[model samples]
Target: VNSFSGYLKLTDNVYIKNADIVEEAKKVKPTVVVNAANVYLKHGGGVAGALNKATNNAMQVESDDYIATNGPLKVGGSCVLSGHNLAKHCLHVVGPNVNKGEDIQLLKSAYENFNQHEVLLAPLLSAGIFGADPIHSLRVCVDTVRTNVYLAVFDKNLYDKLVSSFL
Candidate 1:
């Protein structure tokens, strides 16, 4: 549950006899949130499930809020490998060479790094090959060297509302 809170003012008027307003005021916290369960993150589900995880983040994207993946859901060429629902719509994406060992190995490495961070806010998908992998690490890497969070920041507070559409 993502939440940010604050206070609002009342428009109505009330009269008090020898009453104190300072004591009556209370601190309130308002929030805007995005729950991971509401959306889906998919992967190729092979060799440590790279594609699937990447897809997960994509599905979590709230409208124009930054939504990108690490690599191509399917390796280019005429290979029909199923399982890429979330990969269908990703911006600033990256992918594996598929049939190439070096590329696959790279994919594994990328996923390994990505898996390490607990992303509170989706980090920037890096540059170059491993660069496009969204989320600084797997878990939240709020204090990591060269850390970047990639996200499409929308003005509307509708993370929960958008989730139902994905399911």
Candidate 2:
């Protein structure tokens, strides 16, 4: 998360245990790092559920000139899908499996958000998104954020696809 003051916060080992969990970024706004390796060992405590709820729940990352909210969101697609939901900008990308190299190109487009110093978002699709590929999801996430936008990934596979996809 980045604080309103423009300092950055780097985080590690993050876990969500319940719905409507909220926290503000302090000092230097924090940058969130979510590793859900054993997440399914539990249920309802995953990213999608948290992001979709209406509690305004979020992780506040306080930076020097800004505060980036690692928000609990309600949808997953690309930043193109959630650009308006944020106070700044957003990035959307499809990766690794993207054999055309268009994925990398898309990643560059996402960086445009940061280059403008706009608050961009990159909602990623990973192995967790649909049991796809996490490493790929992560690579794109890193590239997108490295330039400027704050990043977040929603693993869509948490729900049974046949049901969630249909729901």
Candidate 3:
């Protein structure tokens, strides 16, 4: 009777969620909600766009200022944006592109660096047009994170595939 689809438990405190990521981010309201963004911090489609829309487009404005002050976020680097929507804060991280020959360690580094929070809401890093194999991406995610997490998945098929892969 709602939009927040069920979750498949991945480990002790982590799960794969089938829901609009931004909504799920709000549900858990983890200290931070991660955005898989470009090095340019453009807030283009996918997770970045969803969060930008939820924040009334203010995120892009803040992101632009961040880039202007700090330069590009370079792949594997991460930056935080203060609250406006979703969780209490937003962490913008640029993930690697296997399509571009970047190694998976970059994705590993991205999460590894964000290792402090108690809970995190994240999307499937590098699994969209950035192009890491979904199963491999899931493997890295499960392997690296130390905090409790909700991995947001918007598609039914992707959710099914991840659950099957996990099982």
Flag the better candidate by TM-score, 1 or 3. Answer: 3
* Residue-level error in angstroms, candidate 2, position 11: 14
TM-score of 3: 0.89
Model 3: CA > 4 A from native: 1-6
lDDT of 2 by residue, 45-102 (tens): 3433343232232211111112123322212222222212232221222222233222
Q: What is each predicted model's overall lDDT from 0 to 1? A: 0.24, 0.29, 0.79
Q: What TM-scores do the predictions have?
A: 0.18, 0.31, 0.89
What does candidate 1's lDDT look like per residue over 56-146, in tens digits?
A: 5343343123214333233211111222342222222233432333343333333233333332122122212323322222221222312
- Best first by TM-score, ranked: 3, 2, 1
- Between candidates 2 and 3, the one scoring higher on TM-score is 3
Q: Model 2 scores what on Cα lDDT?
A: 0.29
Candidate 3 per-residue C-alpha lDDT over 58-154 given as tens digits, one digit per residue, 9 for 90 to 100: 9899889988998997788788887576778888878897778887788888777457676777888898778888777788888888777778888
Mark the regions of model 2 whose C-alpha exceeds 4 Å error after superposition.
4-46, 56-117, 121-124, 127-129, 144-146, 152-167
Best by lDDT: 3
